Design an enzyme around this catalytic site. Structure first.
Site, PDB file in Angstrom:
ATOM      1  CE1 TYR A 141      46.955  40.746  24.133  1.00  0.00           C
ATOM      2  CE2 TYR A 141      46.754  42.749  25.409  1.00  0.00           C
ATOM      3  CZ  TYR A 141      46.624  42.077  24.205  1.00  0.00           C
ATOM      4  OH  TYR A 141      46.097  42.754  23.117  1.00  0.00           O
ATOM      5  CG  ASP A 161      44.161  47.304  24.662  1.00  0.00           C
ATOM      6  OD1 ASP A 161      42.958  47.355  24.324  1.00  0.00           O
ATOM      7  OD2 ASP A 161      44.983  46.428  24.214  1.00  0.00           O
ATOM      8  CG  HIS A 176      41.637  39.339  21.597  1.00  0.00           C
ATOM      9  ND1 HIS A 176      42.450  39.060  22.679  1.00  0.00           N
ATOM     10  CD2 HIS A 176      42.387  40.069  20.741  1.00  0.00           C
ATOM     11  CE1 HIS A 176      43.637  39.587  22.481  1.00  0.00           C
ATOM     12  NE2 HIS A 176      43.630  40.192  21.304  1.00  0.00           N
ATOM     13  CE  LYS A 194      42.448  44.181  23.028  1.00  0.00           C
ATOM     14  NZ  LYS A 194      43.650  44.147  23.920  1.00  0.00           N
TER      15      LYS A 194
HETATM   16  N1  LIG Z   1      43.641  43.378  19.585  1.00  0.00           N
HETATM   17  C1  LIG Z   1      44.733  42.727  19.149  1.00  0.00           C
HETATM   18  O1  LIG Z   1      44.629  41.678  18.526  1.00  0.00           O
HETATM   19  C2  LIG Z   1      46.010  43.310  19.399  1.00  0.00           C
HETATM   20  C3  LIG Z   1      47.164  42.970  18.652  1.00  0.00           C
HETATM   21  C4  LIG Z   1      48.428  43.541  18.879  1.00  0.00           C
HETATM   22  C5  LIG Z   1      48.554  44.500  19.889  1.00  0.00           C
HETATM   23  N2  LIG Z   1      47.374  44.877  20.645  1.00  0.00           N
HETATM   24  C6  LIG Z   1      47.377  45.920  21.715  1.00  0.00           C
HETATM   25  O2  LIG Z   1      48.152  47.011  21.042  1.00  0.00           O
HETATM   26  C7  LIG Z   1      49.235  47.324  21.925  1.00  0.00           C
HETATM   27  C8  LIG Z   1      50.377  47.940  21.167  1.00  0.00           C
HETATM   28  O3  LIG Z   1      50.728  47.151  20.016  1.00  0.00           O
HETATM   29  P1  LIG Z   1      52.026  46.169  20.051  1.00  0.00           P
HETATM   30  O4  LIG Z   1      52.527  45.803  21.432  1.00  0.00           O
HETATM   31  O5  LIG Z   1      52.425  45.537  18.845  1.00  0.00           O
HETATM   32  O6  LIG Z   1      53.331  47.322  19.931  1.00  0.00           O
HETATM   33  P2  LIG Z   1      53.286  48.946  19.474  1.00  0.00           P
HETATM   34  O7  LIG Z   1      53.007  49.983  20.604  1.00  0.00           O
HETATM   35  O8  LIG Z   1      53.515  49.305  18.049  1.00  0.00           O
HETATM   36  O9  LIG Z   1      54.930  49.099  19.890  1.00  0.00           O
HETATM   37  C9  LIG Z   1      56.043  48.339  19.480  1.00  0.00           C
HETATM   38  C10 LIG Z   1      57.441  48.821  20.087  1.00  0.00           C
HETATM   39  O10 LIG Z   1      57.698  50.218  20.214  1.00  0.00           O
HETATM   40  C11 LIG Z   1      58.623  50.462  21.304  1.00  0.00           C
HETATM   41  N3  LIG Z   1      58.383  51.932  21.635  1.00  0.00           N
HETATM   42  C12 LIG Z   1      57.397  52.492  22.370  1.00  0.00           C
HETATM   43  N4  LIG Z   1      57.537  53.813  22.359  1.00  0.00           N
HETATM   44  C13 LIG Z   1      58.624  54.084  21.623  1.00  0.00           C
HETATM   45  C14 LIG Z   1      59.243  55.256  21.296  1.00  0.00           C
HETATM   46  N5  LIG Z   1      58.701  56.388  21.780  1.00  0.00           N
HETATM   47  N6  LIG Z   1      60.357  55.287  20.516  1.00  0.00           N
HETATM   48  C15 LIG Z   1      60.884  54.096  20.042  1.00  0.00           C
HETATM   49  N7  LIG Z   1      60.241  52.896  20.394  1.00  0.00           N
HETATM   50  C16 LIG Z   1      59.125  52.919  21.161  1.00  0.00           C
HETATM   51  C17 LIG Z   1      58.289  49.417  22.391  1.00  0.00           C
HETATM   52  O11 LIG Z   1      59.513  48.999  23.130  1.00  0.00           O
HETATM   53  P3  LIG Z   1      59.740  49.431  24.664  1.00  0.00           P
HETATM   54  O12 LIG Z   1      58.712  48.673  25.455  1.00  0.00           O
HETATM   55  O13 LIG Z   1      61.120  49.027  24.890  1.00  0.00           O
HETATM   56  O14 LIG Z   1      59.568  50.921  24.715  1.00  0.00           O
HETATM   57  C18 LIG Z   1      57.625  48.294  21.536  1.00  0.00           C
HETATM   58  O15 LIG Z   1      58.498  47.238  21.398  1.00  0.00           O
HETATM   59  C19 LIG Z   1      49.571  45.974  22.671  1.00  0.00           C
HETATM   60  O16 LIG Z   1      50.454  46.106  23.844  1.00  0.00           O
HETATM   61  C20 LIG Z   1      48.102  45.498  23.046  1.00  0.00           C
HETATM   62  O17 LIG Z   1      47.528  46.189  24.173  1.00  0.00           O
HETATM   63  C21 LIG Z   1      46.128  44.294  20.379  1.00  0.00           C
HETATM   64  C1  LIG Z   2      46.450  34.869  21.308  1.00  0.00           C
HETATM   65  C2  LIG Z   2      47.155  36.213  21.230  1.00  0.00           C
HETATM   66  C3  LIG Z   2      46.734  37.142  20.352  1.00  0.00           C
HETATM   67  C4  LIG Z   2      47.519  38.187  20.552  1.00  0.00           C
HETATM   68  C5  LIG Z   2      47.427  39.517  19.773  1.00  0.00           C
HETATM   69  C6  LIG Z   2      47.388  40.719  20.738  1.00  0.00           C
HETATM   70  O1  LIG Z   2      46.270  41.060  21.169  1.00  0.00           O
HETATM   71  O2  LIG Z   2      48.477  41.304  21.016  1.00  0.00           O
HETATM   72  N1  LIG Z   2      48.428  37.903  21.517  1.00  0.00           N
HETATM   73  C7  LIG Z   2      49.507  38.806  22.015  1.00  0.00           C
HETATM   74  C8  LIG Z   2      48.226  36.650  21.958  1.00  0.00           C
HETATM   75  C9  LIG Z   2      48.939  36.072  23.020  1.00  0.00           C
HETATM   76  O3  LIG Z   2      49.323  36.734  23.994  1.00  0.00           O
HETATM   77  C10 LIG Z   2      49.154  34.698  23.136  1.00  0.00           C
HETATM   78  C11 LIG Z   2      49.078  34.115  24.422  1.00  0.00           C
HETATM   79  C12 LIG Z   2      49.283  32.738  24.588  1.00  0.00           C
HETATM   80  C13 LIG Z   2      49.560  31.980  23.450  1.00  0.00           C
HETATM   81 CL1  LIG Z   2      49.804  30.196  23.552  1.00  0.00          CL
HETATM   82  C14 LIG Z   2      49.636  32.581  22.189  1.00  0.00           C
HETATM   83  C15 LIG Z   2      49.440  33.940  22.024  1.00  0.00           C
END
Ligand SMILES: NC(=O)c1ccc[n+]([C@@H]2O[C@H](COP(=O)([O-])OP(=O)(O)OC[C@H]3O[C@@H](n4cnc5c(N)ncnc54)[C@H](OP(=O)(O)O)[C@@H]3O)[C@@H](O)[C@H]2O)c1
Ligand SMILES: Cc1cc(CC(=O)O)n(C)c1C(=O)c1ccc(Cl)cc1
Length: 316
Positions: free
Chosen positions: A52, A47, A114, A81
């Site tokens: 990003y 994803d 997105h 996205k």
């Molecule tokens: N569509 C959107 O608007 C949107 C918004 C937010 C996120 N996303 C997508 O969703 C993905 C995941 O969400 P997100 O990054 O907030 O974080 P998420 O996966 O909840 O993870 C948060 C934390 O968990 C840690 N972690 C992973 N596995 C672990 C484990 N087994 N035990 C303990 N800790 C663990 C990671 O640190 P380490 O890296 O140190 O393991 C990370 O800092 C994003 O990378 C992106 O692709 C999309």
């Molecule tokens: C816009 C946006 C929305 C999300 C939520 C997500 O999908 O995780 N992220 C992580 C960003 C950025 O990376 C981001 C990049 C550049 C700037 Cl200036 C601000 C936010």
């Protein structure tokens, strides 16, 4: 082989995805190494997103694992996205084409809207006026969706969906005249402190897959997340469940989603946690365990993106 679900357009999505967002102080180089590790470990769903700023690196990982014989392209499900600076219909396809050029891939498996609030066109992801005000744009998301549909018809995106849509905004799309393709998914925050039962049931009633982000409680990156908010992985019930199954709270939280019919993303840039996360396929939770997790629900939304609050399309 690997566990997938049939989307409403006939395509299949692996039910565990690897998240690739990392806070900006994390160098981009780590994204390349982490995606390769995720593939090696058995992730088949990756994803990403324009916003990003890692698509060059994530694309290289993917290309590299295909070119070395580790995986075939058809066994990677790659999601990008459409960022809000490219909501205008005539900008949608160029945005996808630019992501594809950065990635050096021919197609994406999934392209999402997105975030439903639009901002002014240009290179800047969060364009601001001289006084720091976000430059909001007025765009009809139904036209934005038509342009997504055309990207599907051109084979540039095998499937299309949305992210951070609420009930009203989904219905707006579903009830659109001349609708050709429903969104295959709605990718939203979802975890035991915000289990989205209501919206989940809605998406199910329309055969739309809910994809859970921040399923492990998020980056907790400031200013986007209030550092006062509770720490998901520190929950005593999750930690008790983990001890009982000889697993981790993270695994319990991931398994919870799989069993409730949600596709779940997990981000980690750490080699050991990346390998650990694929163990979600190694155990199962009882009806009593699942109910306990349902009881943790506390309406805690970690990701508000409230810099985009104000316009009618702000979804929260
Ligand atoms: N569509 C959107 O608007 C949107 C918004 C937010 C996120 N996303 C997508 O969703 C993905 C995941 O969400 P997100 O990054 O907030 O974080 P998420 O996966 O909840 O993870 C948060 C934390 O968990 C840690 N972690 C992973 N596995 C672990 C484990 N087994 N035990 C303990 N800790 C663990 C990671 O640190 P380490 O890296 O140190 O393991 C990370 O800092 C994003 O990378 C992106 O692709 C999309
Ligand atoms: C816009 C946006 C929305 C999300 C939520 C997500 O999908 O995780 N992220 C992580 C960003 C950025 O990376 C981001 C990049 C550049 C700037 Cl200036 C601000 C936010």
């Amino acid at each position: 082989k690997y566990q997938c679900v049939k989307l409403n357009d006939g395509h299949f999505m692996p039910v565990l995805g690897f998240g690739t967002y990392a806070p900006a102080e994390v160098p981009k180089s780590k994204a390349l190494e982490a995606v390769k590790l995720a593939i090696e470990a058995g992730f088949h769903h990756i994803d990403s997103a324009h916003v990003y700023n890692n698509e060059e690196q994530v694309g290289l990982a993917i290309r590299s694992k295909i070119a070395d014989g580790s995986v075939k392209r058809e066994d990677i499900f790659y999601t990008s996205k459409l960022w809000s600076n490219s909501h205008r219909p005539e900008l949608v396809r160029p945005a996808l084409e630019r992501s594809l050029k950065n990635l050096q891939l021919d197609y994406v498996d999934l392209y999402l809207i997105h975030f439903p609030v639009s901002v002014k066109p240009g290179e800047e992801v969060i364009p601001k006026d001289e006084n720091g005000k976000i430059l909001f744009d007025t765009v009809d998301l139904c036209a934005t969706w038509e342009a997504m549909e055309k990207c599907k018809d051109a084979g540039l995106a095998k499937s299309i969906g949305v992210s951070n849509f609420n009930h009203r905004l989904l219905e707006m799309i579903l009830n659109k005249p001349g609708l050709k393709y429903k969104p295959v998914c709605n990718q939203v925050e979802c975890h035991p402190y915000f289990n989205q039962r209501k919206l989940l049931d809605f998406c199910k009633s329309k055969d739309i897959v809910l994809v859970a982000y921040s399923a492990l409680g998020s980056h907790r990156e400031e200013p986007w997340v209030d550092p006062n908010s509770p720490v998901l992985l520190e929950d005593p019930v999750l930690c008790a469940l983990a001890k009982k199954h000889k697993r981790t709270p993270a695994l319990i939280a991931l398994r919870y989603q799989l069993q409730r019919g949600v596709v779940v993303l997990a981000k980690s840039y750490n080699e050991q946690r990346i390998r650990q996360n694929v163990q979600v396929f190694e155990f199962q939770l009882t009806s009593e365990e699942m109910k306990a997790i349902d009881g943790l629900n506390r309406n805690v939304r970690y990701l508000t993106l409230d810099i985009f609050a104000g316009p009618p399309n702000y979804p929260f």
